[PDB]
Amino acid sequence: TPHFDYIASEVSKGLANLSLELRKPITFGVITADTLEQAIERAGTKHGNKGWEAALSAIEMANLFKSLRGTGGSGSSMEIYEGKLTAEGLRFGIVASRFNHALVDRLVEGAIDCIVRHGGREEDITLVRVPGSWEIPVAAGELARKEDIDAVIAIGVLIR
Amino acid sequence: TPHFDYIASEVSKGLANLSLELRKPITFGVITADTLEQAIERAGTKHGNKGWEAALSAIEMANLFKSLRGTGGSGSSMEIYEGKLTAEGLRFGIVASRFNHALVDRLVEGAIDCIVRHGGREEDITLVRVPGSWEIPVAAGELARKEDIDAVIAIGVLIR
Amino acid sequence: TPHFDYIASEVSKGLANLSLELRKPITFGVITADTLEQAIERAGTKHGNKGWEAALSAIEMANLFKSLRGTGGSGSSMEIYEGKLTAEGLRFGIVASRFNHALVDRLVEGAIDCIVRHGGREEDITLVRVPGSWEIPVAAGELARKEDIDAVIAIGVLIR
Amino acid sequence: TPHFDYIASEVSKGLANLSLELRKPITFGVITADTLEQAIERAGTKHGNKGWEAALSAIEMANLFKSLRGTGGSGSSMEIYEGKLTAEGLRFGIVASRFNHALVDRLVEGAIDCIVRHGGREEDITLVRVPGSWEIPVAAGELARKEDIDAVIAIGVLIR
Amino acid sequence: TPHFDYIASEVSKGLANLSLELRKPITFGVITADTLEQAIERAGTKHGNKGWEAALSAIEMANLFKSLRGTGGSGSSMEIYEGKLTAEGLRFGIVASRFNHALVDRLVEGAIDCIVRHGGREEDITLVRVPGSWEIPVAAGELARKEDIDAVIAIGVLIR
Amino acid sequence: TPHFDYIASEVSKGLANLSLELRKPITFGVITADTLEQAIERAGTKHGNKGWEAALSAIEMANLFKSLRGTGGSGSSMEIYEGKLTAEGLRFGIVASRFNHALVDRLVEGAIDCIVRHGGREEDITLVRVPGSWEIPVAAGELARKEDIDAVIAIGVLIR
Amino acid sequence: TPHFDYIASEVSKGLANLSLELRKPITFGVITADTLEQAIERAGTKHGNKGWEAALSAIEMANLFKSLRGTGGSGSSMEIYEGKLTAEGLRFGIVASRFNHALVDRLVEGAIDCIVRHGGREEDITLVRVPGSWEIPVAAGELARKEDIDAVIAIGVLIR
Amino acid sequence: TPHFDYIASEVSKGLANLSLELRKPITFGVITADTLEQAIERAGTKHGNKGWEAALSAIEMANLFKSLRGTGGSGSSMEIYEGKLTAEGLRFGIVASRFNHALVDRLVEGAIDCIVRHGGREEDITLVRVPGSWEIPVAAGELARKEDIDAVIAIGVLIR
Amino acid sequence: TPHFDYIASEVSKGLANLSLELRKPITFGVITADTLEQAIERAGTKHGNKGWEAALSAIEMANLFKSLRGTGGSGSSMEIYEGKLTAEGLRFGIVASRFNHALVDRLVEGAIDCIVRHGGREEDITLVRVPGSWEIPVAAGELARKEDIDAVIAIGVLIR
Amino acid sequence: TPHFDYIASEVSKGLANLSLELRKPITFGVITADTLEQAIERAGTKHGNKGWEAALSAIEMANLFKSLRGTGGSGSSMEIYEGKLTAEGLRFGIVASRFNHALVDRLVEGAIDCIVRHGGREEDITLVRVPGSWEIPVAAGELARKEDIDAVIAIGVLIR
Amino acid sequence: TPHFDYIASEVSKGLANLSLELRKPITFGVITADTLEQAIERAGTKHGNKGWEAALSAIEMANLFKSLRGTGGSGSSMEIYEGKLTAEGLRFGIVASRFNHALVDRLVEGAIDCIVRHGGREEDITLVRVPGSWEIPVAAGELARKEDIDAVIAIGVLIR
Amino acid sequence: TPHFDYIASEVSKGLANLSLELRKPITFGVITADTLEQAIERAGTKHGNKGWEAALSAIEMANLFKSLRGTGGSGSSMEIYEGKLTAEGLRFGIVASRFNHALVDRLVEGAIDCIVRHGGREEDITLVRVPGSWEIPVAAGELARKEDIDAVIAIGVLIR
């Protein structure tokens, strides 16, 4: 049914505009699959875990923004900016939906595992749960406005 | 005819932007079906009632936002935010269209039934009717700006 | 040709955003047909007149907004807001395109007929003509900003 | 390739939003064809010249806006606003792309021919050239902000 | 999978809006291919290098904007504005993604080669790397706000 | 039936010879279609209005003949003669048939609209109606012989 | 559509009768093609330029008529009359239509090139432009009646 | 017909031998297409302009030869020779054929545009025209022997 | 049989090298057809006369070379060299083969006709006949070395 | 096998260049057939003898060159040079290969028969035999450099 | 397209003649493939690296020529000349094109790797870059004429 | 692949030109086969040995050239020149490639066997080895210039 298309378009558009308005990194960890088999593939099976990948992107972006707003350094040569993959000292927020929870809970486990084994603390993670993917952008807007949050990770599953 | 696509795109886009601008929950209770049979399925028959589901999402989001803006509590561990399913003390607004009223009136009945049996009062419900789905976003904007409204529910039916 | 899609997307999007920004009703009276036969059907023939329907929606919305911004009344029960279908005292603006004028002039006749027989005056109607559908949103923006206009009706014909 | 779709969507969307923000007429003179033969048809051959048509729309819109912001006149009857097709005293800007220049230069010739034979002067035309269609909206934004420009004409060719 | 469409739509839309808001040139150097073979074709092989083309567009736009904001000159004739292809004295920023790095690094080489052989210095190039195409718009927003950057080049590869 | 061919041949031949004998411009505004759908296309719909086009040709020819019979001017270079598109001061005659009046009246409206918006007066238009296309040439001969008529426009519809 | 046949028949017939009545050479430089590809072939491509050929015929005919009306000479043998291909001292008029101008302007360039490189002057060429092929015969009649014109060249493009 | 093969073989062979004998750069800007559509593609349309590309090659080769015959410099490392893309101070000759002039004139425009916008002067360009591609090599031999010419550009169109 | 290919390759190659060695124009007037019908087409019938075309090329090249070796003139602008089509004062040589003489004699007639009617004298034409196409290059070498010959025309017919 | 092509190309090319370098006639009497039957046809059977034809060409060319280098004569009219078919006083050389000698010896007989019956002497014929067609050009070079040889005849047979 | 054939023929022919004229080794390291897949196969993948092979041939030829021009030695037996594969003391030049640089840079790496690991120095390698394969022969001619160069390596990629 | 054609064309062309320039016999002993089976057939199997055949041709040519440059003798009759098949006193050079050495070494054995059994000495044979067929012509040029070499034999194998 066409119900799939309109929800997917608005969730992706909402998160993108929000990141530019607040000038803070927000990572897209939402699965958009045509079949149930395709979704299981990406939820901790032969095609990996999308929750793990989204967390890794957030860590890099947080370090990159710390570098851009610093001194930068270097001189007499091309300046190159890049982000490390160390999570020590960073604080993260996660927004997850409850629909298709059999798959979503696998993605949330991956995101937490990535942060901890790269040097982060569970005490620095804030987790917010919403009833559906439609409510992710408005909930993400509340976390992104907090001063002590470095990046936000959005997780959900949509099946056509 | 392509008339279906343009109306559906603008209604979904309008409600999404409105929720982010006013920072208030708005739930998507609009059916978008390809055939008449598919619409009857979701209007109180073998595939459930979409009006009931939209009301349940609104109740949860209202409680969640009450929790985020409070003290929060907890410490020395991962903070988790979630919303209960009790409607005592909450105030709701509903916007419904008149086209395909044979189906829409079934969705409005479900939304009211959900609120009352979860502990709400009919005195706390405000209902606004508009001639069509195109007029839902502008009407929803008037309710969302009232200080004594906690969440808004949008209901409509579109058939290709 | 794909020329049809881009014009249709921008006209619908422009009018929708304009209504939310100015918080005034704007009705969508634009035909979007795949064949010439489908267009004649909706221009005063076996499938009705879209110009008549758009005017009827404008009258209802104007009365509804008068009711929301008033006292409202009622008490100890569910508040219900709805609009009458009387046009006495209301002032309307119309924006119409010149392309496919053989069909557009039938839609403009229907809109004027609806307003007059529901109790309106021709003296209270302002009509603006533009060369094409692409120019409708910018022209509609000038009328919507006038203080003595209650609603705007947009009329046009697009054929793939 | 899908490269065609994304460029076409952004160019049309950019020009539409720009016209509403600055409240000035901007005309869409961009060809969007599926085949090379379809493009030659509309570049000064059996299906006319799109550059000529875009210039004619600009002249009408400029006169219409002069009329709306004037006294208006009339009374005791329905007010009708329309634009003449005389270009005496008007000042125009043109933005043209360089890709597919074998066709684009035919469209620019048509636009200049239309303005001159309707009573305009070549001294009142400002022409800006950009490397591609993607750069049209940003260049059009510089011309539209000048106080002595009445309307802007955008010209380009895209082939799937 | 539909994952390709939503990412491509948001990246193109984000860059377009950013250029209009900041009124600075931003060039679209992102490949959007249906097959791996189509991508290799445009990454330094029989169909050229898209990184080279994007850099050439940036140089022209930078010179054009220098000309518009200057005196302009000329008189008693049609004013024509155009940009040279000399890069002496200009300063450029580049944002590149890490996904499909086997192809992306070919595009970055082309962009640097174009700038140097047209008269630019490597000391005037700032390069920022991001984990994926989704993060390009937010990173591009940081460079575009610097006062000593004349234009920004965005590079990435997406394969359906 | 072959009835279509003989009428069409004689009407076109009659008007052509008449223009050469009297040395005055006469424009061919007669539709010759194979199907009813083809005729509606050219009578104010997706393929334009033939009545508008015929009037535009008459205006140009009238100005051109005023220029040829004047001084001409210029020297030491190639002489070029062309006609403007201003209708101020010109006087026009129109001959229209009554068969297929549902379509013919759309063409007559277009011709009058073109003349007025290019600067002409309705007081300077003479309209003659004949029962059929066969009678157009003899009626056109009476108007063309008047001293105060600058050009004649012939309008009709023939369907095989 | 049969519209092509009637216009083509009248234009060819008009020019032929005009040449016999005034006893002056008139050359037929009008393309009559069934497809767009056939027209491009004869407008300066693999099948030559019809504008060049028409000018060459005019030069020969002008010299031939100068020879017939002279002494003739010769005796006691068969008299043979023929025309040279030198354009020194001759004066030419050209009538060209504006429809399908993308092709017509190529034919006019060829005609001027032929005259100049055979020894003629641009100062001796008079160029008249008309809105369409239907108006060519009446315009050609004005030039042919001038005493200082030796031959007339008619140029146009018609596509079925 | 086999006429295409023999002309193409001799033109390419002639230019190649000439460049080696005189030890001066000569660039191959001749289109060799199987169909008319393929030729239009490369004459300023979706596949670019071959005249522009040939001029760019000439500029690079001229700078490279200036570098080889100079000091060279560098030491204790691999010597690398390359040419810049600045045209300041260079002098160019162009040889163009007249057959298929509708396409050839587009290629000549591109070559001149490239030279001027890279810093060259029109005063430093010498243009020679020949009746056909067969005559290009002998004409190119006269320009290449002049002492004040740095490179030669050959332009033509051949269609099988 | 393959006999056709080897003769055609050597005749074309021989004439091309000869023109470069002696630096004198030589024109290729040899028909290379696959069928007898194709040859008759080009020997004075619906596809013209190749002997006429070859003579016209020789006249232009002779005038061009007279211009290059002269003063040239012009200044402060782009120098353009081109050849007139006047044959007064020029001297020509012709080499023709005897095989397929039924067709060759038609080509020789055309070449002589072209020269005389453009202003040349028959007294200035030298005609040499050889038994076959294989012997054309060696015979052409004797004429090209004479000081009082301006250009050479080669004529022959080969059929596969 | 492709062995046939390379030998045939080099033998024909070698003889052609040799004739131009030494400025002496050399005739091509080599059969190039696809099948054995085709070769027997041309070796003294229903399609004639190629050895006879090559000798006849040599006789004509020898007389022609005697005429060109003489006085020439004639005046006040077109000069025509041609060769007789008398062999009295001429001296000839023949180079023949040994491969396929069953056919080659028939060709050598024909060449000698032609010379004798046209008035030549066997005492004036020099015959050189080589092992194969590849060795013909080098052997022909030794004969052509002798002062008392007027023309050379090359004979061989190649079968694919 | 046939463009591939003519470029390939001239590049191979140019290098071959150059080696014989200067009597110095030149190696053919140019890939000529029908498909992109075939080219990747030979650019450092399952079918090896053509750049490595060309360098190995150059080393052997350089040693062989050193041996031929020396004493030679040996006696009373068959003399055999052969080249070692040691690169100590030799000096090499490389000419490489820029088109299809994604593949060409792999070939240049292989050539340098071969020379160094066989005992050569990077200080003894001269590298020249040209815009395309057409320019390789003229650039190779400049290196081959230097006294301190032992062999030249030509590298390029052409794809049909 | 087309790689086969270009190498084969240049090797055959190089050897042919070399023989004419130095006026010394050079024999073509290179196999050009389409399949591996065809090559084994000609390398000492059912279709003979090409190395043996090439040596036999060299012996004959060496004796023939000794006869031409001698007295010649004979008189009062047709002079006939031919070569014996005795190798006593003659000196030979051989150039062989290393690619496909499994087959090439069979051809070299045949060439040596032919010379010895016809009366030659192994002491009079000089053998030069090159890495590939491309290097044969340049190596053959060094041997052919030695005064004490009577003929050269070229051996190689190419497989499509």
Author numbering:
A (entry chain C), B (entry chain D), C (entry chain E), D (entry chain A), E (entry chain B), F (entry chain AA), ...: 3 to 162
Structure paper excerpt:
As such, we found that a circularly permuted variant of a cage-forming enzyme, Aquifex aeolicus lumazine synthase, cpAaLS, assembles into a variety of hollow spherical and cylindrical structures in response to changes in ionic strength. Cryogenic electron microscopy revealed that these structures are composed entirely of pentameric subunits, and the dramatic cage-to-tube transformation is attributed to the moderately hindered 3-fold symmetry interaction and the imparted torsion angle of the building blocks, where both mechanisms are mediated by an α-helix domain that is untethered from the native position by circular permutation. While the wild-type protein, AaLS-wt, self-assembles into a ∼ 16 nm dodecahedral structure composed of 60 identical monomers,35 the negatively supercharged variants AaLS-neg and AaLS-13 adopt expanded 360- and 720-mer assemblies, respectively, constructed entirely from pentameric capsomers. Moreover, a circularly permuted variant of AaLS, cpAaLS(119), forms not only ∼24 nm and ∼28 nm expanded spherical cages, but also straight ∼24 nm-wide tubes of variable length. We previously designed two circularly permuted variants of AaLS and confirmed that their morphologies depend on the positions of the newly generated N- and C-termini. The native terminal amino acids were connected via an octapeptide linker using genetic fusion and new sequence termini were introduced either between residues 84 and 85 or 119 and 120, yielding cpAaLS(84) or cpAaLS(119), respectively.
The cpAaLS(84) assembly resembles the AaLS-wt cage, where each pentamer interacts with five neighboring subunits in a dodecahedral arrangement. The atomic model of the cpAaLS(84) cage revealed that all the constituent pentamers interact with each other in the same manner as in the AaLS-wt assembly. The 2-fold symmetry interface consists of a hydrophobic patch (L8, L141, and W137) surrounded by a hydrogen bond (H41) and ionic interactions (e.g., R40 and E5) while an α-helix region (120–131) forms 3-fold symmetric hydrophobic clusters (I121 and I125) in the cage interior. Irrespective of the tested buffer conditions, cpAaLS(84) did not exhibit substantial fluorescent changes up to 110 °C, indicating little protein unfolding.
